[PDB]
Amino acid sequence: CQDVVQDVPNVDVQMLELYDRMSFKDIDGGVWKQGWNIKYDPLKYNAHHKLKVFVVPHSHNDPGWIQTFEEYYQHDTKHILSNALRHLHDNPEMKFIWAEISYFARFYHDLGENKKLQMKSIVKNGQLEFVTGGWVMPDEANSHWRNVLLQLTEGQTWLKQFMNVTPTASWAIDPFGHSPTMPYILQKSGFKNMLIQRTHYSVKKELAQQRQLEFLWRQIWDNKGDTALFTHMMPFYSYDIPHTCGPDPKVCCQFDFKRMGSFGLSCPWKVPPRTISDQNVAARSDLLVDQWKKKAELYRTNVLLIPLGDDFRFKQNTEWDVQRVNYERLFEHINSQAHFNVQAQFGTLQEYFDAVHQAERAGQAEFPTLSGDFFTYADRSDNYWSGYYTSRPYHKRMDRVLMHYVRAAEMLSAWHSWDGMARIEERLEQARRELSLFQHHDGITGTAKTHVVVDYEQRMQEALKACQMVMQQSVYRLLTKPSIYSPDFSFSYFTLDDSRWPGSGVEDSRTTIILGEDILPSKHVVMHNTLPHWREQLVDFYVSSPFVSVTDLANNPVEAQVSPVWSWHHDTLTKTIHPQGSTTKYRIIFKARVPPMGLATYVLTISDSKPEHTSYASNLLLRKNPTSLPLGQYPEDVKFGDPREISLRVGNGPTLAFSEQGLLKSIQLTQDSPHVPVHFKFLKYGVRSHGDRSGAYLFLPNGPASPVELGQPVVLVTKGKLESSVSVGLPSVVHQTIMRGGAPEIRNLVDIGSLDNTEIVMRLETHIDSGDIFYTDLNGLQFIKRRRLDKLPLQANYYPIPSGMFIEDANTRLTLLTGQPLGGSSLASGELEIMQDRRLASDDERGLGQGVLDNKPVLHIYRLVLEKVNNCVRPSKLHPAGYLTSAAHKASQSLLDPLDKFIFAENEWIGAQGQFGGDHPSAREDLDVSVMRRLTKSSAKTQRVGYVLHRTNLMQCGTPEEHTQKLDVCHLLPNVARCERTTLTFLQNLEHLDGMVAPEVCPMETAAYVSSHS
C-alpha cells in the first residue's frame, strides 16, 4: 500500500503551486482575447510530417436547464437523435459523439426494432460513438463521488446491455470547473482518456504557453502515479464552433455553416459563413488551415482535435447537410493540396486519443504529470462561478438525503432475491435514475429555471418514496420469522421517520406514534445501520404521551429522555420569532445500538406515570417580556429569564458557552482545558449596484460581508441527560446547537424569505493561527489544501464545500462537516465561513434568464469538531492534501449516513425478531461498503452481488484503536461460488479471486467486487 501522507508526489504541474506563482493578469490578448497572437513556423509540417486533423461533430444536450428533460426531449433531442440515425446511416464517412445516456436511453426505447438495429449498426461500425457514457455529464463541484459513480454506472450499464459498448474516453465540456475525483473514478472504471473545458482563463493561458494542456492527471497524494489518467484540456473560452477551430472566433464563426441566416443564427463578429464552392475553397482553406496550425502550436503531437458542435445542434436534416457538405469540400481541397501538409477528416473522440498515443509511442512527445483541481472557475475578468456552490440549497440538501436512501434501499433489499411481483428492481431503477439525473451540471448546481428545479424536485420525491417502499418491505422480510412472513408487496408494514428531512419547520411530515390505554399500549420501531461497523447513535421519535419507556426485544430497559416538540413561529403580530411547545406530541430520545449493515428492534410502551428509565429535559426560554408555554402532560414546567450567557455540558463531552444571543462563543474540551474561543456569527453579502450582478452562477459581492443586526433574539435552552440544545430565532435563521456528548451538531432552519439581493453566510471566528491556509473536500472523497490569495477577488477564494472544511495550526484544528454541499472559504486567519442561501433579483448573463427568487425553507445540518492535533502525524508543509481525524470522519458519517428509522404501521407485528446482522464483521473504522447491490434478477441461476469498498485515510494521533475484524464482502452472502474484483461499474472482471476472498483496500483506494452464489 502507498503511503498517502508522508511522500510529497513529484509532478510537473501542481495546481496549488501554480496558483501561488501565477499573476492572473487579465490583458487583452488580441483576437484570442485571453491568450496572445499565436505564431507558427510554416515549415514545421511537411511531406514527412503532416498535421492529422480530426473534426468531431457533437451536440450538447442538457438533461434539463431552460426546459425540463422531457420538454427538451420532445422539442429537440428526439429529432437530433432521429436525424443523427438517418444521416450517419446514409453518409458512411460522417461521425458523431454522444454524451448523455439518459436522453439516448429515452430515445432508443421508443424506436421500432428496425431502427434499433440500424442504430446498433452505426455504433458497432464506429460512426456514432459514446463519450463517457454516464446518465448525464455531471457537476463536479457539489456532487458526491458516490453519486458520480452511480450515474456513470447507470449510463454504462445501459450501454453495455443495449449497445454492447463501454466508453473508455470521457467528454466533459460544460461543468463549471473540474475535479480530480473524475479521473479517480474513471481510471478505476476502465477509462484511458478524458477531456475537460471549463478551467480559469488564466490557467488555460499558462498551460498553453508551456504546451501543458495535455497531461497525466494523478491524485494529489499519489507518489507512484498509478492513478494517472491522460487528460486533454481544451484551450479556448467556449466549446462552440467559434472557439474551437482556432484562436480567432471571427474566423472560426465563418465555419459554423448553421449561421448563414435561415436557421436564425449569425456571427456576432459580423462576418458570416459562406457556402464553400470551387471558387472560394482555396481562400477558405487558407484561412481555416491557418487557424488549425495556430491551435496545433498549443499541443505536443501532430494530431489535432477540432470539436464541431454547440447546444442541441444537429437537429434539422438541413443542418446535417449544410455542415457535412461544406466540410467535405474543405477536406477534399485541403487533403489534395500538398503545400498544407494536412490530412483532415471527420473523427470520433476515441480516434483522436488513439492517434495521439500512437504519436507518443513513436517518441513524438512526452506529456507532463499534473495533480490538483480546477476550482474556482472564471470564464472572464472577475466573474468567478462560486455562486452555484450554494444556489438552490434546498435541493443540494435533498441530493444528500436521496444519496443515502438509495444506498440504504439497494443494500437492505440486496440480502434477498425478490419475486418480480415485488417490483423491487423496478422501484430501485427509478430511484437511481432520478438521483442520477439530478447530478447534471444544471441540477444539483441550482442553475436551472424555476419550473425545471420543480421537475427535479418532484422526480427526487418519487425516488424517495420508491426507496422507502423497498426499504420497509426489506425490513419486514429480514425481521419476520420465515414461516410467518406473508408479504403484500403494495402494503406499508413500516413508515420511515426522518428527523432531518425535510426537517422541523420545513414540513410537518413525521408521524406521531399514537399510544394510549384505550387504543394501543406499545409500538415496535426498527433502526438500520448501513455502515459496516457496530454503531450507536441517539434516535428520536414523536409520541402522543410523555410517559413512554423503551426496551430492546429481550425486554431490557433502555435509558430514554423526553423533550417537548418545539416549533418556531415568526409572530406576525408581536413581530418576534419565538417557539411554541406542543401539548399533544413529545419527542422521545434513546441510544440505539445496531449491527454492522444490520437492524435492531426496540419497543416503546406507554405507562400512566413517569417510567423508571425515562428522564425529562428542563427548558428555559430567555427573552424579555415572556408569556407562558404550557406543555400538556409534560412533567417539567418551562422556566423563563432575561437573555444571558449560558454554558452547557452533556455527558463527559465538551462544555460549550454561548453568548446572550444564543450563539456559540467557546468550547472547552475537558474539565481542565481552556475555554477555546470559537464564535458563530451570521453576516450578509450584497450585490453590486453598477457592474456585473451576482446570479445563479456568479458570486459578485459588493465587498466583505456585513454583520446582521440581531436585535435581542429569543433563546431557547433545553437541558437533558442525553441531549441538550440552545436554539435562537434569528432573522432568516433558527440556529440550533445540539449536544449529545461529543462534537455538537449545528442545524440552521434557513428562510431567506423576501430579502432581495442578499447572501447569508455562517462564519466561525477562532484564534487558530491558520494564516492563509484552509482545507475543503472534493466530492466527499478527499480534502485538498487551499491557499487564500489576496491577489484574487473575494469570490475567487470561495470553493465548493461538498461535505467539509477545516483550518488548523500546529496545535489546534477546527473542522466543520456538512450534510449538504454549500460554498465557503476562510477569508482571514482563524476563520471558516459557509454560505447558507442566496436570493438574487438579477440574471447573471450566462443564459439562465432569471435571478434566484424561488428560495424555500431548508434545514442545513453540520457537526463542529474542535480538536488538538499537535500529536497527529500530518503531511509535510509541501503536501497538497489534508486528512480527517477519526472523530471528524465519524461526524461526517453521522450526517451523510445516519441510522434509518422505521415505525411498524399495524397494531401487532407477528413473528417480529430483534436483530439482523449480529454476525456481520465490524470493519475497521476507515473502511466503508459504499454500495451493496444485487446485480441479478431472481430468474438467474447464478446470483451476483456487487460491492463497492472505499477506505479513506485517517490521521494517526496516538489513539490505539484496535479490535475490528477483516471484512470479506465475498462471504457476506452464503453459498459463494466465485469472487471477482471488477471495475467500479461492475461491468468488467479484472481479477478472479483466490479462496473467493475479497481483500480489503488500501487507504484512499476504492475497489469493486462481485460475488457469485449458487
Ligand SMILES: N=C(Cc1ccccc1)N[C@H]1S[C@H](CO)[C@@H](O)[C@H](O)[C@@H]1O
Ligand atoms: N455552453 C453552452 C454553449 C454556449 C452557449 C452560449 C454561447 C456560447 C456557447 N451552454 C452552457 S451555458 C450554461 C452556463 O452559461 C450551462 O448552465 C448550460 O448547461 C449549457 O449547456
Ligand SMILES: *[C@H]1O[C@H](CO)[C@@H](O)[C@H](O)[C@H]1NC(C)=O
Ligand atoms: C459486442 O460484444 C463483443 C465485444 O467486441 C463482440 O462479440 C462483438 O463486438 C459484439 N457482439 C455482441 C453483440 O455481443
Ligand SMILES: [Zn+2]
Ligand atoms: Zn450544459
